[PDB]
Amino acid sequence: EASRLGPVFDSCRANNRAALIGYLPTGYPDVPASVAAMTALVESGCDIIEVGVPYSDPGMDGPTIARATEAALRGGVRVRDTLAAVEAISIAGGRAVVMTYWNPVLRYGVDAFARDLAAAGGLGLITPDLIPDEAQQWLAASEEHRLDRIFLVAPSSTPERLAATVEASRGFVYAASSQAAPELVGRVKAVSDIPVGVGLGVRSRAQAAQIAQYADGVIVGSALVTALTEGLPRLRALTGELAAGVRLG
């Protein structure tokens, strides 16, 4: 049986391009506006949406997204708002996964959250502070509810841990990061054919193009939050520039 995000990358590889993967946090600047912006991402060329659950202590988030999630939590954003954002993206014909720190999921209930996310049209889950070593409940709920599980690898990942993390993944494996990123993608592709997305502080078409040379997916987060802060039209402009970048010909 195939992963939920499988056919998306197949279609992209057929059209000689990478999948454009866009991140936006729920509730920034408020819940309606963020849903409007996530909908605009679907309308502007985003193949996959990363719906971020704002967390009070986001260790892996850079300053741009940290300030956005702080603002979203001040506005009273809830975990259920992320489920509603996913329903909106499904209705708009998009494809949404959820990026979340693990404690909100534990609080919600791991099986309950997988069930409700799947019902909401969600396709998978990106877990930046959940390593395979702690993912027993998640792997069972991932299979029970047919959700993709996107773990992260890093440049410093040991050969043993990298293979284990790739073997535990489904959909794509998130390669987070001079030449470190392509070398990391090379190591993943040396052991598996799973799609690899690359996050690299992308903020221009040219950068998106470089990553599409070796990666199956280009992940853009900080730059979209910055563009959204300026306004919805700027976000549409930027996303179109990025959709052009992932396309090689």
Partner: protein, 405 residues
């Protein structure tokens, strides 16, 4: 030489089952350096030369052993029970935290790390880390919240006089738990040459075990001392619980002593019902936080609730996983102590014994008085006096109207 590992977690760092407390809730980008530390500690904790080095620094540099003092003038206020104070307030730098930084700083040298980072709340652990790094010639960078830096001018000066660098964390709530997040980001970027000297018995494996081991010396000494001074094992061993390092350090030697009650006292702030507190076990629930699965103060969605206490060291919304296991297993009881009970104990210890305790330790003294009333005349209660209260004189003076306006 090295003590057995009967109470240790599994290879994944879990207490009480492979899906129990502790573990490693960290990003994969950190797992390489965490495995490097775990292997380094696993090698050195059984190295006689390493334990000889640490013992040498504990004796001649830190001043161990710390004495056990029977506060005979506290008896009347503790139901005529007998209060024995384990005097970690007499350690070099003034708290038990020196035991931790001496171990981890030796470890960072053993690993070839040249740079040490650490978090600090009001400055206790940053000064302790900067102290060990000065002693061992390690470069030190302390992360401290911008609210705490502006409020702790002299502690920043101490750390600088010790050769360390202080960074103001102006993100998040700009306090202890956001300093920890900033140090975590530093380590992710600089794992190659940087050691993270963590300040309590929490975090991902192997830090709860490692920190507990560097603090076990407290309970090991106290168990010998209380038998020599009272003639028997005590009826109870109590301590205050922020992250848990000083409590677990004095608890551990008594775990398999069936008749010894173990009680940890946590900061109740204005009251556990006010929502201005830090009573993690009393009002928190299980969850993943700062690298481990344990108890923390969190709302319905899993977001961290900001804690409040008149003490800085107890003002932390989480707690170490080995305490969560001991709570679940019924080995240790965890009880709340308010700001007022602690300040009441703080003052009584000043007038009765001439010992100015840390406000953190005053919570344990306060609880010890209450326990003495429950246990009654003649009960032997050992109290961990985790630190001296010189850092807290200004706060206590204001509380008791000794500064005026």
């Amino acid at each position: 030489i090295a003590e057995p590992t009967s109470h240790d977690p599994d290879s994944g760092g879990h207490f009480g089952g492979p899906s129990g407390w502790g573990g490693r809730y960290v990003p994969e980008a950190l797992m390489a350096v965490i495995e490097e530390v775990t292997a380094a500690y696993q090698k050195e904790r059984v190295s006689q030369d390493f334990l000889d080095d640490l013992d040498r620094l504990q004796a001649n540099y830190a001043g161990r052993p710390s004495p056990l003092y029977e506060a005979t003038r506290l008896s009347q206020h503790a139901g005529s029970a007998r209060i024995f104070l384990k005097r970690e307030d007499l350690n070099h730098t003034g708290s038990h935290k020196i035991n931790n930084v001496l171990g981890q700083a030796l470890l960072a040298r053993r690993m070839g790390k040249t740079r040490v980072i650490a978090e600090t709340g009001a400055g206790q652990h940053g000064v302790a880390t900067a102290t060990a790094c000065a002693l061992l010639g390690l470069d030190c960078v302390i992360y401290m919240g911008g609210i705490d830096t502006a409020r702790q001018a002299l502690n920043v000066a101490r750390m600088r006089l010790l050769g360390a660098e202080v960074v103001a964390v102006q993100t998040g709530s700009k306090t202890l738990k956001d300093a920890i997040n900033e140090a975590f980001r530093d380590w992710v970027a600089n794992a190659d040459n940087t050691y993270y000297c963590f300040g309590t018995a929490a975090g991902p494996h192997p830090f709860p075990t490692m920190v507990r081991d560097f603090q076990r010396i407290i309970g090991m000494e106290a168990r010998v001392q209380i038998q020599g001074q009272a003639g028997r094992l005590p009826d109870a061993v109590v301590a205050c619980v922020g992250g848990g390092s000083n409590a677990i350090g004095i608890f551990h030697a008594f775990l398999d002593d069936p008749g010894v009650r173990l009680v940890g006292f946590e900061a109740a702030g204005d009251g556990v019902e006010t929502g201005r507190h830090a009573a993690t076990f009393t009002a928190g629930s299980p969850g993943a936080f700062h690298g481990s699965f344990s108890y923390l103060l969190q709302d319905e969605d899993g977001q961290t609730i900001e804690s409040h206490s008149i003490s800085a060291g107890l003002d932390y919304p989480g707690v170490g996983p080995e305490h969560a296991w001991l709570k679940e297993a019924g080995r240790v009881d965890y009880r709340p102590i308010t700001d007022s009970e602690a300040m009441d104990a703080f003052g009584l210890l000043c007038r009765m014994e001439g010992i100015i305790p840390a406000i953190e330790s005053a919570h344990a003294v306060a609880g010890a008085l209450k326990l003495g009333v429950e246990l009654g005349r003649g009960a032997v209660i050992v109290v961990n006096l985790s630190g001296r209260g010189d850092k807290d004189v200004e706060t206590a003076a204001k509380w008791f109207g000794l500064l005026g306006n």
